[PDB]
């Protein structure tokens, strides 16, 4: 039904994004961490769901801005993808904004390959910036 892609997400901070079986998500310098492969599924117009292939775990985002690992598909698994300066890709939350300022909460890593909270990751910061290194295109249900 859905036409998505399989890919590795390379943080501009210098790491491959890694979804470990235990649900722990981080950044690694390992090329062949098979936990670094992901399913990008267009669940809408410029809205994507991300899945850690090795653990089949959806990279969901709960009520606190934490990217926990989820099996069930919740609308919290929805991410508004958007380009920054026509050079970097960023996935924001469909639920989260600095409800006053409207500044959304993005997926982001610090300089140490560690995951950051949603509200601490700025769109303009290298934390939120990712480059998709794709593998192949795939059909999904």
């Amino acid at each position: 039904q859905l036409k998505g892609i399989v890919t590795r997400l390379f943080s501009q901070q210098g790491y491959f994004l890694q979804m470990h079986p235990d649900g722990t998500i981080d950044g690694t310098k390992d090329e062949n961490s098979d936990y670094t492969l992901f399913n990008l599924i267009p669940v809408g117009l410029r809205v994507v769901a991300i899945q850690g292939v090795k653990a089949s775990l959806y990279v969901a985002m709960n009520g606190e801005g934490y990217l926990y690992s989820s099996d069930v598909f919740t609308p919290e698994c929805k991410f508004k993808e958007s380009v920054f300066e026509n050079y970097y890709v960023i996935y924001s939350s469909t639920l989260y904004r600095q409800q006053e300022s409207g500044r959304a909460w993005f997926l982001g890593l610090n300089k140490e390959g560690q995951i950051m909270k949603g509200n601490r990751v700025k769109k303009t910061k290298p934390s939120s910036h990712f480059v998709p290194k794709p593998i192949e295109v795939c059909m999904y249900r």
Binding site: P42, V83, E85
Partner: protein, 142 residues
């Protein structure tokens, strides 16, 4: 802007998308950007204008009508403001107007990187040719 520009837009679109695949190849974008009528048109050389626009590309190197339209229009609308709310509204209108669901594909890479890469390949190739030329020149004597 007026409805005439949007109808014109869909009109050119049907030309560039005779199968209504809701996508065009990036190589032709420039041409398309030059093909429109004022003020939406971006006359060649338009490449820089196209490169400064937030323009997502799905695989493989294909771009969607909604993004192109939103960008070309926003270039005229400037920052917003009410035009962004109207942008979202018209985006929803376009979504509803669109048949089927398969045309929804996720972002892969973007413009700049493509054109930069092509540029680099060009320069490298030429440079190589001239290295060859210089070597043969070294050969001639003697």
């Amino acid at each position: 802007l007026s409805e005439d520009d949007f109808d014109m837009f869909y009109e050119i679109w049907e030309k560039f998308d005779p199968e209504a695949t809701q996508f065009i190849e990036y190589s032709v974008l420039s041409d398309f950007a030059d093909a429109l009528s004022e003020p939406l048109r971006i006359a060649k050389p338009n490449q820089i204008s196209l490169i400064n626009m937030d323009l997502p590309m799905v695989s493989g190197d294909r771009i969607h009508c909604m993004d192109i339209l939103f960008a070309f229009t926003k270039r005229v609308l400037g920052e917003s403001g009410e035009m962004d709310a109207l942008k979202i509204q018209m985006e929803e209108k376009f979504m509803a107007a669109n048949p089927s669901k398969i045309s929804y594909e996720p972002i892969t890479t973007t413009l700049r990187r493509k054109h930069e890469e092509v540029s680099a390949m060009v320069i490298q190739r030429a440079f190589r040719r001239h290295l060859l030329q210089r070597s043969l020149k070294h050969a001639s004597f003697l």
